[PDB]
Every structure is written in C-alpha cells, then in structure tokens.
Design an enzyme around this catalytic site. Sequence first.
Site, PDB file in Angstrom:
ATOM      1  N   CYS A   1       0.780  -1.229   0.000  1.00  0.00           N
ATOM      2  CA  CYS A   1       0.000   0.000   0.000  1.00  0.00           C
ATOM      3  C   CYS A   1       0.844   1.330   0.000  1.00  0.00           C
ATOM      4  CB  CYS A   1      -0.935   0.055   1.191  1.00  0.00           C
ATOM      5  SG  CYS A   1      -2.141  -1.261   1.138  1.00  0.00           S
TER       6      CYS A   1
ATOM      7  N   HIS B   1      -9.403   2.440  -2.639  1.00  0.00           N
ATOM      8  CA  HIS B   1      -8.049   2.042  -2.250  1.00  0.00           C
ATOM      9  C   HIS B   1      -7.402   1.197  -3.337  1.00  0.00           C
ATOM     10  CE1 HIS B   1      -4.807   1.785   0.591  1.00  0.00           C
ATOM     11  NE2 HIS B   1      -4.831   0.464   0.608  1.00  0.00           N
TER      12      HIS B   1
ATOM     13  N   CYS C   1      -0.321   3.185   6.122  1.00  0.00           N
ATOM     14  CA  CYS C   1       0.048   1.917   6.729  1.00  0.00           C
ATOM     15  C   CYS C   1       0.329   0.900   5.631  1.00  0.00           C
ATOM     16  CB  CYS C   1      -1.057   1.402   7.655  1.00  0.00           C
ATOM     17  SG  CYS C   1      -2.564   0.884   6.805  1.00  0.00           S
TER      18      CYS C   1
ATOM     19  N   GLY D   1       1.026  -3.298   4.667  1.00  0.00           N
ATOM     20  CA  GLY D   1       0.910  -4.683   5.074  1.00  0.00           C
ATOM     21  C   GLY D   1       2.253  -5.286   5.436  1.00  0.00           C
TER      22      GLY D   1
HETATM   23  C1  LIG Z   1     -14.692  -5.905   2.948  1.00  0.00           C
HETATM   24  C2  LIG Z   1     -14.750  -6.555   1.564  1.00  0.00           C
HETATM   25  C3  LIG Z   1     -14.533  -8.059   1.716  1.00  0.00           C
HETATM   26  C4  LIG Z   1     -16.155  -6.331   0.976  1.00  0.00           C
HETATM   27  O1  LIG Z   1     -16.262  -6.786  -0.382  1.00  0.00           O
HETATM   28  P1  LIG Z   1     -17.570  -7.732  -0.507  1.00  0.00           P
HETATM   29  O2  LIG Z   1     -17.357  -8.936   0.331  1.00  0.00           O
HETATM   30  O3  LIG Z   1     -17.729  -8.206  -2.052  1.00  0.00           O
HETATM   31  O4  LIG Z   1     -18.927  -7.043   0.052  1.00  0.00           O
HETATM   32  P2  LIG Z   1     -19.442  -5.803  -0.845  1.00  0.00           P
HETATM   33  O5  LIG Z   1     -18.253  -4.705  -0.941  1.00  0.00           O
HETATM   34  O6  LIG Z   1     -19.795  -6.286  -2.194  1.00  0.00           O
HETATM   35  O7  LIG Z   1     -20.740  -5.080  -0.194  1.00  0.00           O
HETATM   36  C5  LIG Z   1     -21.338  -5.971   0.747  1.00  0.00           C
HETATM   37  C6  LIG Z   1     -22.738  -5.491   1.191  1.00  0.00           C
HETATM   38  O8  LIG Z   1     -22.598  -4.370   2.059  1.00  0.00           O
HETATM   39  C7  LIG Z   1     -23.345  -3.222   1.555  1.00  0.00           C
HETATM   40  N1  LIG Z   1     -22.573  -1.982   1.794  1.00  0.00           N
HETATM   41  C8  LIG Z   1     -21.238  -1.854   1.539  1.00  0.00           C
HETATM   42  N2  LIG Z   1     -20.824  -0.680   1.828  1.00  0.00           N
HETATM   43  C9  LIG Z   1     -21.863   0.035   2.287  1.00  0.00           C
HETATM   44  C10 LIG Z   1     -21.932   1.341   2.724  1.00  0.00           C
HETATM   45  N3  LIG Z   1     -20.756   2.039   2.690  1.00  0.00           N
HETATM   46  N4  LIG Z   1     -23.100   1.809   3.132  1.00  0.00           N
HETATM   47  C11 LIG Z   1     -24.173   1.029   3.116  1.00  0.00           C
HETATM   48  N5  LIG Z   1     -24.154  -0.227   2.707  1.00  0.00           N
HETATM   49  C12 LIG Z   1     -23.011  -0.769   2.281  1.00  0.00           C
HETATM   50  C13 LIG Z   1     -23.505  -3.517   0.030  1.00  0.00           C
HETATM   51  O9  LIG Z   1     -24.638  -2.911  -0.615  1.00  0.00           O
HETATM   52  C14 LIG Z   1     -23.654  -5.070   0.006  1.00  0.00           C
HETATM   53  O10 LIG Z   1     -25.027  -5.422   0.225  1.00  0.00           O
HETATM   54  P3  LIG Z   1     -25.302  -6.945  -0.234  1.00  0.00           P
HETATM   55  O11 LIG Z   1     -24.045  -7.690  -0.420  1.00  0.00           O
HETATM   56  O12 LIG Z   1     -26.176  -7.657   0.937  1.00  0.00           O
HETATM   57  O13 LIG Z   1     -26.132  -6.943  -1.632  1.00  0.00           O
HETATM   58  C15 LIG Z   1     -13.631  -5.969   0.678  1.00  0.00           C
HETATM   59  O14 LIG Z   1     -14.038  -4.707   0.147  1.00  0.00           O
HETATM   60  C16 LIG Z   1     -12.350  -5.786   1.461  1.00  0.00           C
HETATM   61  O15 LIG Z   1     -11.695  -6.741   1.808  1.00  0.00           O
HETATM   62  N6  LIG Z   1     -11.911  -4.550   1.775  1.00  0.00           N
HETATM   63  C17 LIG Z   1     -10.673  -4.371   2.539  1.00  0.00           C
HETATM   64  C18 LIG Z   1      -9.430  -4.429   1.646  1.00  0.00           C
HETATM   65  C19 LIG Z   1      -8.261  -3.851   2.394  1.00  0.00           C
HETATM   66  O16 LIG Z   1      -7.681  -4.518   3.223  1.00  0.00           O
HETATM   67  N7  LIG Z   1      -7.866  -2.591   2.141  1.00  0.00           N
HETATM   68  C20 LIG Z   1      -6.739  -1.989   2.856  1.00  0.00           C
HETATM   69  C21 LIG Z   1      -5.404  -2.576   2.391  1.00  0.00           C
HETATM   70  S1  LIG Z   1      -4.429  -2.995   3.860  1.00  0.00           S
END
Ligand SMILES: CC(C)(COP(=O)(O)OP(=O)(O)OC[C@H]1O[C@@H](n2cnc3c(N)ncnc32)[C@H](O)[C@@H]1OP(=O)(O)O)[C@@H](O)C(=O)NCCC(=O)NCCS
Lengths: 388, 389, 389, 389
Positions: free
Chosen positions: C87, C345, C375, C377
């Site tokens: 990152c 991100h 930060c 990883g």
């Molecule tokens: C968390 C993570 C797994 C989510 O991806 P996902 O599993 O496919 O889940 P989604 O992003 O598709 O959204 C999931 C649900 O939450 C809801 N939702 C997500 N964000 C929302 C928000 N900000 N407000 C309201 N609702 C929200 C979505 O509409 C969806 O509804 P549904 O799945 O029941 O139809 C993924 O984005 C992730 O791992 N992020 C972190 C990555 C990271 O580590 N970044 C930093 C690098 S160190």
Amino acid sequence: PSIVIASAARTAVGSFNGAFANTPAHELGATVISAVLERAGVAAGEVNEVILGQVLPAGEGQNPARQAAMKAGVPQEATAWGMNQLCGSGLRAVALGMQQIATGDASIIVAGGMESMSMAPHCAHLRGGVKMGDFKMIDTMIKDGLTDAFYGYHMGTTAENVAKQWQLSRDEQDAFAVASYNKAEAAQKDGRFKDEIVPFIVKGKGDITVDADEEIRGATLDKMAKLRPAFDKEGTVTAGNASTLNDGAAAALLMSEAEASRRGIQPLGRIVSWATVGVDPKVMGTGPIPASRKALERAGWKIGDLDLVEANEAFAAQACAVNKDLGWDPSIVNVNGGAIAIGHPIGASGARILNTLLFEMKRRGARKGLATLCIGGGMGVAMCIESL
Amino acid sequence: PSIVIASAARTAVGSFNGAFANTPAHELGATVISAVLERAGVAAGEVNEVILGQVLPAGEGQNPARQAAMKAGVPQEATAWGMNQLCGSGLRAVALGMQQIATGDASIIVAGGMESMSMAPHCAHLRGGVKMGDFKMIDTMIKDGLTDAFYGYHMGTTAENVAKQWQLSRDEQDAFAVASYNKAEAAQKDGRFKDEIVPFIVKGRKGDITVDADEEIRGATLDKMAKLRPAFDKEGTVTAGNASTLNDGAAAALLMSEAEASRRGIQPLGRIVSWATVGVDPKVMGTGPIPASRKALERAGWKIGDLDLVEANEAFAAQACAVNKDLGWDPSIVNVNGGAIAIGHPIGASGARILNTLLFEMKRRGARKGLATLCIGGGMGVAMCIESL
Amino acid sequence: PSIVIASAARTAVGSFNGAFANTPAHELGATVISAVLERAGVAAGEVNEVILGQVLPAGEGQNPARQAAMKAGVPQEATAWGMNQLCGSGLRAVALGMQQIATGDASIIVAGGMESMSMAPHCAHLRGGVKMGDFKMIDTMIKDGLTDAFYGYHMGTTAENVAKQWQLSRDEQDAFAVASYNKAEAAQKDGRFKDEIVPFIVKGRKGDITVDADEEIRGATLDKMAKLRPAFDKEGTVTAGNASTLNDGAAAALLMSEAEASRRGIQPLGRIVSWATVGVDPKVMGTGPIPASRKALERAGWKIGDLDLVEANEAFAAQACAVNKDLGWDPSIVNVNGGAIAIGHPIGASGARILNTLLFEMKRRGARKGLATLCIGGGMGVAMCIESL
Amino acid sequence: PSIVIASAARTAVGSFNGAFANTPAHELGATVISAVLERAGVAAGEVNEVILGQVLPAGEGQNPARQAAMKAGVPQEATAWGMNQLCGSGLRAVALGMQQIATGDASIIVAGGMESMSMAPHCAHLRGGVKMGDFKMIDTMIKDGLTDAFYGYHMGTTAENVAKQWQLSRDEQDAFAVASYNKAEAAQKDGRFKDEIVPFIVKGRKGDITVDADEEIRGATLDKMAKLRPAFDKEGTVTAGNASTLNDGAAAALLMSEAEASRRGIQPLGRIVSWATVGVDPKVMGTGPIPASRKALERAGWKIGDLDLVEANEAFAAQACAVNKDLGWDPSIVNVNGGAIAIGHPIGASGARILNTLLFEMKRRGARKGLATLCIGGGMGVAMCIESL
Ligand SMILES: CC(C)(COP(=O)(O)OP(=O)(O)OC[C@H]1O[C@@H](n2cnc3c(N)ncnc32)[C@H](O)[C@@H]1OP(=O)(O)O)[C@@H](O)C(=O)NCCC(=O)NCCS
Ligand SMILES: CC(C)(COP(=O)(O)OP(=O)(O)OC[C@H]1O[C@@H](n2cnc3c(N)ncnc32)[C@H](O)[C@@H]1OP(=O)(O)O)[C@@H](O)C(=O)NCCC(=O)NCCS
Ligand SMILES: CC(C)(COP(=O)(O)OP(=O)(O)OC[C@H]1O[C@@H](n2cnc3c(N)ncnc32)[C@H](O)[C@@H]1OP(=O)(O)O)[C@@H](O)C(=O)NCCC(=O)NCCS
Ligand SMILES: CC(C)(COP(=O)(O)OP(=O)(O)OC[C@H]1O[C@@H](n2cnc3c(N)ncnc32)[C@H](O)[C@@H]1OP(=O)(O)O)[C@@H](O)C(=O)NCCC(=O)NCCS
Ligand SMILES: [N+]
Ligand SMILES: [N+]
Ligand SMILES: [N+]
C-alpha cells in the site's frame, strides 16, 4: 410381447445460463421420474430400472442416473445407468428400456434423458504436468457435445455442408426458422404444452416455479435476416436458424401391454418398431432419412400411413433436407414447433420430442406416429408409435 | 434364440500414469475391436453396432465409442454408443449387445469397455465467473468414479463398512491380497494371459513401444504388505496393498446368434445362458455380487454347486472375502489366475476384462458352466452365466 | 539539494469490476504519466526515469512500468522499473525518485503508482503436475495483496487487533466511516477533485466512455452502516462499510530540483522536505503511520502543531481512529476531502493518490506545511512531509 | 559519501525444475541474508532495510522481501520491499541501497535478488466469467519474464536481431558458448565458487538435501552444440546450447559507509565507485550494456583500459559477442569463471549473482578496478564500477 408407454413427462426447456443455470441434471431428472410415476398410477417401488441418456455428466458425481432415481424415490433394489448416443440418447434409452421388457429381464422401465449444458465445466489434463508454456482449458460442452471428433469443426459446419449439397438458401432456412417460432408460440398460448410439462421448483432468496419454455419467443423475418453467420464467416447457418443450448429433462414409463391392461392403465401408445442407422459424419443431419425408412419397414408402414411426425430440428438446413428426401406432408411434421424455438437439451432431446409426439397424438386422435432425430458423428434414430 | 460369444480380446492393463499415460481410451478400444474381428474371421463391414462401456469420457470428444469403431475400420453405416454403469459397464454392455441380437434388431455386436483413468482431466464450472476468492479444480476421476454421491466418501470407505459388518481383520485381507498377487504372477509366467491379451503399440516421438504384459503384476510379500498404512480411515483396514489400483485398458467380445456362428463355421468361446443386475445399499456396495449371482443362477436354472469356474472382480480384499463367504462356493474355482488386486481395475473396461479371463480359462481346462460377477458403485451388482460349446 | 514536485495527476478511482474492469494498469499509468508532463510544460524527451509502484503485475507482461512509459510517449532512452512495498508503493516511489535527483543520478523523474485489482488473475503452480486429487486456484489479489503471509488471515483481521488493543467500538468506527463518506461527497460536488483528476477514455466495442469522477463516492447514512454484517470475524467490528474497498486507478508526480524548476519557469506544487519508513508488528500493521510520521516530522524539524493539512490513509476505520488518537493532531485538518473508505483504495497507487489530494488541497487553501502517511501490510509505515512554494 | 560492500553471498544456482523445484524464493532469500550478516559480523537488529529484486512474485504472498527478511531473523522494526527491472533487478537493488546510505536515510542495507522460476504459476483472468468456449492458462514465467510486451516474441528473437546487425554466424556463437562452459567447468573443479556460495538445506519429507553446487555446469563440446536445432526462429542462430537457461537462486550483498566499516573493523570486499542505467530499442535489447558501461566508466573517471576484471551477463551468445566487440576490452578478463550460459540465469537474482563472482574473483587475483553489467528486456542496460580495497 408388446411394449406400451403408459405415461410421459418433461420439464420446461431452460435457456443457456438461464432458469436452470445452477440446477444439476439429476435434480431435473428426479422431477420427471416422479412425474411419470404419478401420471400412471405406479408406485416407485415397482420400477425395475431407470435408463437416462446423458451426454455431459462431467462433475455430476457417480452415475447421475442412479442419483436421479434415488432422489425420485426409486428403491435401492432397483438399478439405474446412463448411456450416451449424443442427441439420440433420450430416444435410444426408450428403445433400450423397451428391449429389457421384451427379453423378459424387466417389467417396468423408466427411460428418458437429462442434460444441463449450463453446468458443464471447463477441463484440462494436468496429471503429467505443464513443464513450460501455455495450455488451454477445454469447454466440455463444445468438445464432447458440439465438435466432430473426425473433422474438428462445430456441428453447425455440418449443417452448412447439408445446405450446400441440398442447395438450401439463407432465405428458405429463415422462413423455416420463423415458421418454427410461430408454431411454438401458438402452441404455448393455446396451452398445448401444459399436459407434457411438469413444473420444476428452482430452490434458491425464495423458490421459483419454472413452468414454461423460456426460449419460445416471437420471431420476425426481418430481424432474422440481419443476423451474421455463426460458424462459416460466409455461411448460411446463424444463431436464429440453429437450435440453442438448453437444459431440461424428459422421460417415459414402459411396461408390457398385458401389464398395462391388468393395471387398468390406458396407455399413450404402443411401440411398434425402431431403428438406428449410421451416415457420413460430414452430413450427420441426413441421419433421420435411412433411420425413418428402416423403422417404417420394420413396422410395415408406408410414409403415407403416418398421421403425425416429430423430427428434431437441430438446424433449419438439416430439417429442410429431411422433409424433402422422405417427402412426407410437412403439415403433419412438428405441428407445435421444434428445437429451433423450444430448445435442444442434447441428452434429453430424444425423449423431449417423443413427449410432444405422444401427447399430440392423443390430443388429435392420430393413430400412427414417428419420432426421429439426427445424431452427431453421423447417425440417425427413429421410432414408430401406434395409438391405443 | 441363443447368443454366443464368438471371440474376445483385451489389452494389457497399464499402470496409473504408466504405459498408457497419454493414450486415449478409444485408441485402446480400437485395438481390441480389431482383435475380436481377426480372432473370429469376421470382417469389420459385418458389424452392426459397437457398445463400449466407459465411465470417464470427459475431454475425449464426441462419443468415444464411435471414434474407436471408426479407427477399427467399422463402416459408417454401423452405429456405436457408450454406456455408464460404473465398474459393471464392460459386462453390462455385453448383456445389452446380447439383447440386440435376441430382439432381432442386430446380427453381430462388438461389446466391451474402455477406460483411461490417466487421461482423466481436472475440471471446474467457470461460466458464472469467480468475482473474488479461491475455487477448486475437481479431479474428474475421484469425483465421477471413486466417490459415493450420497455419502461423499471414497469407495474404500464402503469396503471398510463391509469389513466391519462381516468382521474381516487386516490379516485376512492382506492374506487375500498376497494370494491374489501370487496367482497372477504364476499365470503370467506360465503364459495364461497371452491368449486374451492383444499387443498394443504406444506410438511415441522417439520410437514406438509395444505393451504386451500387465504392468501391475508384481511379487508381493506379507511382510511389506503388513507395514502399509490404511489409505482411507486413519484407523482402518483397507490399504493401498489390499485395494485395487487405478489403471488403463480395454476389452471387448464379439456377439452373434448360435445359428449364425454355425453358418460361419465359428467355434464359439461360450453361450450366454443368463444374466442379472440387482441393486443394494450404497453403504455396502461391495455386496452387489451376492444377489446378482443368485438371480443369474436361478434364471439359468443352475445351483451354486453346478459352477465349474467363477470370476469375481476383486475391487477390495474385504469385499471379495465377503462375497465368497456368503455365496459359499468353492474358493479354489474363483479367480484361478488372480484378480483386480494384482491385475488392475480399469473401471469402464473391468467388466469385460474379467469376462475375457473367464472365457479363455474355461476353454483351456474344459469347464462347462461359468459365472462372472462384479460389484458396482452406488450399490449395484451384475452377473452373467456362460455355458461352453 | 532541494527537490520539488512540479506537477501531479491521477485517474478517477474505479470500482471493483467497474469502469476499469478490463483496463490494464499500464494503460491507466500511461494516461497519468502523459498528464503530469503536459501540466508542467515538460517534453517526454526530458524524462530520465519512470518509477511506478505496483503490487499485482501478474499477467501484464514484461515490466509494466516500461509499457506505461512507452505508451505515454517517453522515449526509449529513458529507463523504467516497478517497486512493491504494498500500500505504500505509490508514496515510496516518490521518495525513491527524490533520491535519484538528490544523488545526481537523474534530473527529471516521473514517480507514482498504478493498480488494476479487477485484472488480477487466478493462478496455480502446475509444473510438477497433480497426479491425483483436487487443488485450488489462488486469487492473486487476495494472496499477494490482502493476506498476511505470517499469520494467514485477511488484513481486516489486523484491524480487529487494532480495535481490541485500542478499545474501538463499532459505533466509533461507523461514525468515522460516515464522516469520511460525507466529506468526500461534499468535496466532489464542490469540484475540489477536478484539478487533480485527469479524464480517462475507456475505449469499448460499442462506443467509448470517458471516466472523470470517482464512482465509489456515495452518500452514506449511519443507519445503513449499523445494519451491515461483520466481514471478517464472525463476532467482530470491521464491516464492508467501515473498511476501504478494492479499486483500480493510477497516480503520479513529476519531480525535479528547485533550481531546475526555476530555470524552466515552473511554479511547483510543493517541496519534499523529509520522509521516513518504519516497521511495526504485522499483527497490528495499522499503527504503521504512528512511528513513521514521528520520524518524518523529526527529520523535517517540525512539531505536530506545525502541520496545516494532513492526509492519513484510511485503510480501516479502526486503524485511522488509533492513528488520530496516538499522534493527537487536529482531526479537522486530517483528510479534509475524505479518505479511502469513501474514495477507494487502489493498493499500488494509493500512496501517490493521497499525495495528489494533499498537494492540490494545500494550494487551494494556502496551507504551508503538510504530511502524507500510510500503513503498509506486513507491519510497516511510510510518511512524507510537504512544504508549499 | 562513500559506500563499500562489506560482504556478499549467493546460493547455488539450481536448474529449472531441479533441486529448488518446490523451494519458494523467500526461503532462498533468507539464506543469503543470514550469510551476508555473519560474513560481515553484523547483527540482524542493525539492518535498516532489505531491498530484494524479484520479477516473478505471483503466488508467493504479501511482499516476499519482508518474508525473506523476517525468516532471516531481521527484526520487525526494519523495512523491506521488492523492485522489478527484470534481469537487472538484482544489480539495481544494490545501487538503490547505495543511495539510501548516500542520502543519509540509512546506515546498513542488505540488497540483492531472489528468483524461483520453477515456482512460477499459470494464471488466467476469470472474474468476468467464461460464458462459452476455451481459454488459455498463461505461463507467468513466459509472459511476465521472457516475452517482449511491445513485439510479443521471445527474448531469444531479440538476440537474433543482435546477431543480424553484427552479422554473427552460428559457428561464432557456439564457440563462445563452449568457452563459457569450459571456464565454468574449470572454476567449479578448482573450488573458485566455494567462497561466494552459501549452502542451502532443502528440507523434504524424505530426508534433507544440502545444495551447494551449481547443477547447470556440465562442460560442453562443439559437436553436440552444432547438432542442436534453433529454439526460436525456424531458420535462426540461437539454440538451447548458446542461450542462457531457466534457473532458481538468490544473491545479496551488505552495504555500509566506508567510515562505518572502519569503525567496526570490517574489511570490505570493494567500494562502489559509480553506476549507470540506460535505455535502448527493445528490438535490440542486447546492446544495453554498451551505453551503460561507457556511461558508468565516464561517471567513475575510468578508461576502458583501466578495468582489471569485467563481469558481463551472457544472456545470449549473440548478445555477449557484440558487447565484447564494441567496448573492445581484453576477452581474457571478461567472465573469467564463465557466465549465465553455463551457470544459469535466475532473472531476479542475476544482477547480484555476477556481482558476487566479480567481488570474490577480484580478491582472489588482486584486481583493483572491476565492472559488472547486464542487458535488460524492454531495451535497457545497467552497469556498476567497483574498486578494491
Ligand atoms: C470488505 C470486503 C470483503 C467487501 O467486499 P464484498 O465482500 O464483495 O462485500 P461488498 O463490498 O460487495 O458489499 C457488501 C454489502 O454491504 C453493503 N454496503 C457496503 N458498503 C456500504 C456502505 N458504505 N453503506 C451502506 N451499505 C453498504 C452492500 O450494498 C452489500 O449489500 P449486499 O451484499 O447484501 O447486496 C472488501 O471490500 C475488502 O476486503 N476490503 C478491505 C481491503 C483492504 O484490506 N484494504 C486496505 C489494504 S491494507
Ligand atoms: C449458434 C450458437 C453458437 C449461438 O451462440 P450465441 O451467439 O451465444 O447465440 P446468442 O443468442 O447468445 O446471440 C446471438 C445473437 O443473435 C440474436 N438472435 C438469436 N436468435 C434470434 C432470433 N431467433 N431472432 C432474432 N434474433 C436472434 C441474439 O439476440 C444475439 O444478438 P446480439 O449479437 O446482439 O447478442 C449456439 O446456440 C449453438 O451452437 N447452437 C447449435 C447447437 C447444436 O449444434 N445443436 C444440435 C446438436 S447436433
Ligand atoms: C488405494 C489407492 C488410494 C492407492 O493410492 P496410492 O497411495 O497413490 O497408491 P500408491 O501405490 O501410489 O502408494 C501406495 C503406497 O503403498 C505401497 N504399496 C502399494 N502397493 C503395494 C503392494 N502391492 N505391496 C507392497 N507395498 C505396496 C507403495 O509403494 C506406496 O508406498 P510409498 O509411496 O511410500 O513407496 C488407489 O489405488 C485407489 O483409489 N483405489 C480405488 C479402487 C476402486 O475404487 N475401485 C472401484 C471400486 S468398485
Ligand atoms: C532456450 C530455451 C527455450 C530452452 O528450452 P528447452 O528446450 O526446454 O531447453 P532443454 O535443455 O530442456 O532442451 C534443449 C535441448 O538441447 C539440448 N542441450 C541443451 N543444452 C545443451 C548443451 N549445453 N550441450 C549440448 N546439448 C544441449 C538438451 O539436452 C535438449 O535436447 P534433448 O531434448 O534431446 O535432451 C530456454 O532455456 C530459454 O528460453 N532461455 C531464455 C533465457 C532468457 O530469455 N533470459 C533473458 C535474458 S535478457
Ligand atoms: N434459434
Ligand atoms: N493392490
Ligand atoms: N467502504
């Protein structure tokens, strides 16, 4: 002895990646096996054997015919097995089941076919290991179902060969395709498919009842004429005048004529003859021509005796050639449409058109019928049915 | 009518990723189809239909039975199709071919089976797409061949159930395995397999290789056998030594009516007098041959004491011990040349393979009444009774 | 010597499988590299080297930085290479480019990062061969980007560790997330992102599409946040709403000495005054920015009270709360236009992305001293101090 | 601002799918990091940063440089990151680490490279989904390592372009290859590789194996060399014999200021006097070392006649012949122990490998001025000048 078809049933033919996109083939088969038993007043504990034609069983587990029979309630004492003669599997399984009773080795057979082309996986042989370079993941649907092993091209290219040898233009094939859609749309609106179709519950965020063929749509000759050729870059076969990729299942219940009489069953029809013949793989669409002639000879019928004919329309080019050679009345051939509009589930297509032939014969009082299909690799199969 | 087996042939049973590691099943099948024609004095142009049992056809192309028949010289006018009843496919295809002639729909049938478990690919359903995360490539051999669909465990776990229900110890299973190896090595050294085996030429880029002997037949000792760890249950009895192996091969027979064979001056290997197929509980699928053999004997009108020779497929040592104990036939007439524990178990072709061994051994020692039988995954059994001519 | 940032640019941050679902990372990089040159009045023939951070280059071909530089019009005389510090790659590449000019080995550097997580493939090691059994196709995005190599769990689990040690409830994390969405939604409507974003033309088969705005910026309510299920621990606090998303994009900067910028009449965005990188425990990788920022401020001779504007990357709501509490800077000057929780991100480009927002916002409001930090990883942090000119 | 190399080490260069067929790159990288610390008398807690060049990191996990440093015993407070300039990554990482100390941002750096081309996986983009038809599993080693992104053909085709421009016959390239094999065969028997090679313990389930010798060194004869068919062009000059091979291995060096080594009583292997990197046309990437070496010598203030030892990476016999012809240095001082044609070419580590051979050979014969150089895919070159102490 004499073998009758006491009952028959089939599912709605689903579209590729459509209603049955995640429904295994044996789940469709279990619904049809249960249906033919209820429609004949025969308990599952009386079934001796289940013969289900299936072409793409990769990833379905050990013997999907056994799984469908067990899920349908057939007892473990009975046996079940699958067979593969491509597009004629569904109809050949009925002929095989008919022979089990004819030789006295069984009393009640459930025969048919099932296919889930949406669930076909991609595969590659990886045991030896790829030391270096790229390799291909093979689509099992294209490889084991729609590609000729001897010449390597698609089955649609074989239809192009029939179009050249019989001199069938693009306009005559589009007219055949539009006529097939219109006959199917009229039969669906009039409810002529409700008797043969058994509803299927797609269990998912709520269950969905699939009750109608999702491929039957309204077709116009202008929209069909704008389509580009799908196989040869300067060819005649398009996505419109060729059958589609589909999912579905169909089956029939077999028993002797004396057995049906003892049970008070009024059968759909009596199997009087059948035949299977091979042709050149380059023109596999001409399969039904010698197969139908041989079946009629075995039955002792002339072509003019047939009151109803069901010929599987794999391609508009092949179906036009079959009607031209045999010279039967086209007004009695596929009166409710064909695979160009309804769909073509490979393993189940043989039993599917056999369902349509049986219910339409009883609906209009036809006495003598014939079902026939073309088979990849250069084969044809046909069966003659007489009403009771 | 009466249907006879005019001739039979089989390839050498190759080892997993061995001699036939890159040979498709239809190439093995074509060699056997050509052999049964030469051994009977019947030209390929007289064959009506070819019925080849096969369990793992994924990736081999459209209808491998048709490919094998065309490569063997069978004309395009004839028909061909495959069938899948797992381990009994090879023997069931013969029963189906016999019915074609019995109902008058054919005159000459080539029936058997072929399998190339080395060529089985890995697969995965990818049409919907994997948006994120890992997924598994499935071994089609394990999934569609060696795993029970209802309970999920390997076929070896079903043998463990037979071992528990019949109280078969590890020592009795190893003794059966070593005895099977010794009977097979003696038959191979004495040349009792040369009649049934047709040689196969493996065409390679750096010179061709002729496969003429079963690559699994080796010398086994009870000491090395007793040291093997269980292969399925962590505290079980079935090991890699007392269980059949994964193999490649093909086998077939030529069927016709007795009057047709008489008109051609053919001296047939035997007459099919009866057959039967029965289902059992999938938990103990190894017990399939028990009701199937009894039903076949009754259809033939024979008692168990009438049998002069028996070929029972040894999927596992535990399963084969239970079949001999229940049926109670003389174990000295059962698998006199060894079994699948030492020779191998090509699933699609195994049914026709043991039928080959049964036919040639019957003719050399003058046995009159024989029986072949196998167990089938998912809880089924198949058996056939043959009378000499 | 003194190193300045003459210009900067970035693409719109696209959603996972969204606008850039089939756009390779170097195509995004080419658009930003050409943009920083046009915005500074510098011909491509004057660039010495191109340093592009990238974390997931599998399947893009030989050295995607070279491809991006060549497609951007940089002549073959220049050199290009990629670097991977996860990152912090985008911000570290700027620090590396600054060192090239400081040591006299170059005069003009284009530094930044690019990432296309949508284009990351699934992979498996297949050279040895799978003799038997199933194997898994590995998602390279999860494996090489979002999974800790030492402990095996997702990066979100490390945020759960930060939540436990710092006693961070779900309510404080959702409140930080909603506040992050609202600041980003307000900044986008006011047009505070138009200067830094360069439009990208997505060429498609059925007409071209111009991507000019971040498609991840959405309106969030605290009520919708509390209904979300935990995404990592079955009884945890981090959800998909209070965690950053997976995204595609690119960002870059143009570096040169202060005398070089004066000779070319360029009015620079800011002067790089210090930088630092520190490692921490991988279990609590979110605390990386704490010692890294303190070292950068110490190297620059600044106190925390000297900073007029701060950009701290919000990988997770829990991580950003701990950084603000420990360092104790004014939260009203931290990420005034939102953060990665709302904007997105793109891992390889996130370091250069937050540097773009920090540079353009500093000139918009006349801030003198700024700081960017992230930060990393595996337990690392990186920070840079910027002074306006 | 003077930086010395206090110590250096490398593993045995393993063959493709050989001793390191299942050894991840960070495990090889950890062994070299531990070796350079003990060979210099430096505790792991004193290392500031670890810079490891790596070209094929797909499937290896988050930041393999960090994994290699953690496994080598470097504390978590230190930092680590990877970089990719293809075949010159290993040597460029040393220049980058030298700049960290020169700019005062570090005191002790471990720089080098690691590569396990055997562990490179096959990959495919599967997120959108394959609705119908076949797709290709892409070899990440060929795609991301040995295929030009601009023209699409193999790197061996670029060597054919160099052979054409310099009009190099098949006979002149095969003679150059055999000379490298013989110089490598003599160096191994005389033990001239024991000082630089650190043994690696390949821990397996069936006993540990100690790998301490380069397994590609075999000794070649011109008769077998002339019988080989061309590997790229159907009527070409580059064969498998006169081209470098695919290999696994790692190499690193330890950097510090000259006052630091004097303060610790460390006697360094040599002093870095200058370095340079230049870009050329990707069609003729083999000409990379020509402007890079001349630029480094100009920066160092040396004439070509001043060099006592030269290490030029022999990517291909055609490329290496043209480089020796242009600079015109004494061929008896170039690759005195052989080159990548016989020893091997681990892409990520090759830059640090030839730097290891150059440093130990300079000490063995007392050479004062040396030069290491490589060609880089995509049209680049890198060179470094070393002076002994
Ligand atoms: C968390 C993570 C797994 C989510 O991806 P996902 O599993 O496919 O889940 P989604 O992003 O598709 O959204 C999931 C649900 O939450 C809801 N939702 C997500 N964000 C929302 C928000 N900000 N407000 C309201 N609702 C929200 C979505 O509409 C969806 O509804 P549904 O799945 O029941 O139809 C993924 O984005 C992730 O791992 N992020 C972190 C990555 C990271 O580590 N970044 C930093 C690098 S160190
Ligand atoms: C022909 C075949 C390749 C079609 O593949 P396809 O391109 O995915 O067909 P699709 O319907 O998904 O798309 C076809 C196009 O024609 C249009 N089209 C299809 N059928 C149409 C119709 N009946 N009327 C008007 N338009 C039609 C579709 O909407 C689509 O338009 P688009 O280009 O904008 O997407 C495939 O169905 C096939 O192989 N059929 C033969 C299988 C077979 O051989 N069966 C017998 C075995 S012997
Ligand atoms: C049993 C089975 C799992 C074996 O898999 P396997 O472990 O790969 O077999 P292998 O021979 O490669 O390895 C077996 C081990 O036992 C040893 N072994 C095998 N056969 C032996 C024998 N006959 N005597 C002594 N030792 C033997 C092998 O040398 C090996 O030990 P090692 O690897 O340490 O050298 C496999 O053959 C199988 O699945 N069979 C199923 C058969 C079946 O289901 N048939 C259909 C039922 S109806
Ligand atoms: C050239 C290359 C394609 C070789 O692939 P390969 O064919 O698998 O190499 P192999 O050694 O396994 O096979 C080569 C053939 O030549 C023979 N051969 C190889 N080296 C030989 C030698 N030194 N002397 C005699 N014979 C030799 C091999 O034995 C084999 O013949 P065989 O199959 O009959 O036994 C591959 O090594 C390559 O692409 N290298 C490029 C490295 C590179 O691009 N570096 C980039 C630097 S910028
Ligand atoms: N159609
Ligand atoms: N065995
Ligand atoms: N989010």
